[PDB]
Amino acid sequence: LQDGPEPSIHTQQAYAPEDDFTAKWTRADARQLQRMSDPTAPSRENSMPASVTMPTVPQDFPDMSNEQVWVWDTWPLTDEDANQYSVNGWEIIFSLVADRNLGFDDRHVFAKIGYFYRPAGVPAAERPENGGWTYGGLVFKEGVTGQIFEDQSFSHQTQWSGSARVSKNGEIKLFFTDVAFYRNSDGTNIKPYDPRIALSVGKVKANKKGVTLTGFNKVTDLLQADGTYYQTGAQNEFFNFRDPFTFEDPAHPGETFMVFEGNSAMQRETATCNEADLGYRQGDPYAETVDDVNASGATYQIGNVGLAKAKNKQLTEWEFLPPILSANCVTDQTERPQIYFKDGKSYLFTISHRGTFAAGLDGPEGVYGFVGDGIRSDYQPLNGGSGLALGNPTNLNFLGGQPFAPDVNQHPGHFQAYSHYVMPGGLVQSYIDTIGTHDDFVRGGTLAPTVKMDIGVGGDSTKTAVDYSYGSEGLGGWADIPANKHLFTNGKFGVAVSDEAAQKIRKILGSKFDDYLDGKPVSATVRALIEKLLAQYG
């Protein structure tokens, strides 16, 4: 480590989910990112430790949709434990997609949710190079997602990210961010944009030819920023409020929680930070003062991670709870939060950009992570108190540039990946934003190779390390988002079975099982034979 401040003290102690306690990712903590960086790293080389750096993605990459659409934020079908599912022999994922004729940077205001599918239970060696996904098209018919807004005068209306919960009968609860914009033709706001956390219910319809979806004809408005816990558009024109991820906490069975991205609810122009946001140890010679930080503009970076609790079992009504993490004077964006459970701990993972760090701070694009003894805890930022779990290769000694304009001295993989999502077993999927140099770069809009991050190295829960023996020198399959659970259902009754059990059941039962899964009528006798057999392997 370069000389610098000590990281903050965090205890990992748990609080009640409903308690008014918010962990801080502090300035002292974030400054560890600069300590970890090698100040001698030459132009265009990585300055960050290999163990917390994503393997370099080749500039020669396949496109998962054969360039039919731009694809970015992606999520699997999950249950309450975040296991990932196939249904009737098909892995299914949801993705933000946009018209490929757009410039990649204009995707945001024309974003829609689409889906992809591919066969389940296929070994890596047998899977096509591009991941083997088929694009299934858009989830929502025109007009559906606009229904929730009182003011229908929007210039743009989009679907942004969330998650999708699957039931044993193939019902899908799609949690997403439903967004309305009110922009003049120059792009200036008439009024602040209106992002809401929303739900739409639908269902998998599968057969040997592929997957279609039914339903998704009504949207329920679940949550909008309140102004006491989560910043509003009145408080900040460019406020963040998005990305619902739902789960059950093993420490609180019977309840369903949601994390999402917000900002701390302070008026933009008068926001301030305190000693705890700065987080310095007593007497640290590298400590900053509150006055200096408050004078710096760092107060414009006040991202947080929210928590809400379901008020019913259909998940159609939610109660805000206090934020579980704030990064005041640290970053504007703690995006796509997820809670990941391992070894009795709560890991909060969130993604952030380099450019979104506050004045005086710096860090790579990638996934930042925190560990505690509860979903609301005094979270310990991972890896030396830094918070960095997996960064793109980054030279912190030179400016970061932008994905539309790489810096002449920056590593060509600086923007190679974003929207990293941690899957069971520490597998991480992401999309490609930009790969290349100042003079020769390309945009991605397709998924990167899946990589493997080992969580809790050497008995130390606060440490992670990239597995460079995974796949080819750390790079697994392109767009690999594998299901570890496998549902079989006629749309009414459903069971989860192993892939090997799935193959045996299909062999025993023959074509009548195809009919059962396709939703086709069979006799009550045949139906009971099939379902009793499925139940045996459940």
Alpha-carbon gap, residue 68 to 64, rounded angstroms = 9
For 526, the domain range is 485-538
Q: Which residue has the tokens 């990167």?
A: 448
Query: Are 397 and 491 found together in one domain?
Result: no
CA distances from 337 to 108, 342, 351, 392, 486 (A): 19, 16, 7, 18, 25
438, 469, 484: which is the final residue of a domain?
484
Element (H, E) at 88: none
Q: What is the DSSP string of 505-535?
A: HHHHHTHHHHHHHTT----HHHHHHHHHHHH
- All residues at 6 or more sequence positions from 99 whose CB lies less than 8 Å from its CB, including other chains: 69, 70, 110
410 is in an annotated binding site: no
Instruction: Please count the structural domains in the chain.
Output: 2
User: What's the DSSP call for residue 421?
Assistant: E
Query: Are 516 and 399 found together in one domain?
Result: no
380 is in an annotated binding site: no
Give how far the C-alpha of residue 116 lies from the chain's centroid of Cα atoms, to the nearest Å: 17
Q: What was the elucidation method?
A: X-ray
Exposure on the CB side of residue 368, measured as CA atoms within 13 A: 32
Query: Are 216 and 104 found together in one domain?
Result: yes
> Is-contact 413 398, C-beta < 8 A?
no
Long-range residue pairs from 141-147, CB within 8 A, at least 24 positions apart, any chain: 141/216, 141/217, 144/200, 144/216, 144/217, 144/218, 144/219, 145/178, 145/198, 145/200, 145/219, 146/180, 147/218, 147/219
Q: Buried (b) or exposed (e) across 47-68, using 16+ Cβ within 10 A?
A: bbbebbbbbbbebebebbbeee
Query: Are 413 and 506 found together in one domain?
Result: no
129 is in an annotated binding site: yes
Count of C-beta atoms within a 10 Å radius of residue 23: 25
Alpha-carbon gap, residue 472 to 480, rounded angstroms = 14
465, 484, 503: which is the final residue of a domain?
484
> Is-contact 204 121, C-beta < 8 A?
no
> Is-contact 36 388, C-beta < 8 A?
yes
Count of C-beta atoms within a 10 Å radius of residue 437: 14
Query: Are 515 and 461 found together in one domain?
Result: no
Burial of 14 (0-12, 13-18, 19+ CB in 10 A): middle
Query: Are 502 and 467 found together in one domain?
Result: no
Query: Are 462 and 511 found together in one domain?
Result: no
- Active-site residue, selected from the candidate residues 73, 261, 362, 515: 73
C-alpha torsion sign, points 99, 105, 107, 110: negative
443, 462, 484: which is the final residue of a domain?
484
Query: Are 164 and 271 found together in one domain?
Result: yes
- Active-site residue, selected from the candidate residues 335, 373, 433, 480: 335
Alpha-carbon gap, residue 473 to 369, rounded angstroms = 24
CATH number (domain holding residue 335): 2.115.10.20
CA proximity to 258, closest of 148, 173, 169: 173
Query: Are 360 and 401 found together in one domain?
Result: yes
Tokens of 491: 């749309």
Task: Give yes or no: 335 in active site.
Answer: yes
Alpha-carbon gap, residue 339 to 261, rounded angstroms = 12
Tokens of 77: 């079908």
SS3 for 142-166 is CCCHHHHCCCCCCCEEEEEEEEEEE
Alpha-carbon gap, residue 410 to 30, rounded angstroms = 21
275 is in an annotated binding site: no
Task: Give yes or no: 237 in active site.
Answer: no
Query: Are 81 and 49 found together in one domain?
Result: yes
Tokens of 312: 């019913």
Give how far the C-alpha of residue 530 lies from the chain's centroid of Cα atoms, to the nearest Å: 38
Q: Is 210 left (phi over 0), alpha (psi -120 to 50) or beta?
A: left
SS3 for 388-411 is EEEECCCCCCCCCCECCECCCCCC
288 is in an annotated binding site: no
Query: Are 106 and 124 found together in one domain?
Result: yes
Angle between the N-to-C axes of helices 499-509 and 524-537, in degrees from 0 to 180, rounded to the nearest 10: 150
Distance in angstroms between the alpha carbons of the first and the last residue of the chain: 51
- All residues at 6 or more sequence positions from 269 whose CB lies less than 8 Å from its CB, including other chains: none
Alpha-carbon gap, residue 405 to 326, rounded angstroms = 30
Query: Are 444 and 524 found together in one domain?
Result: no
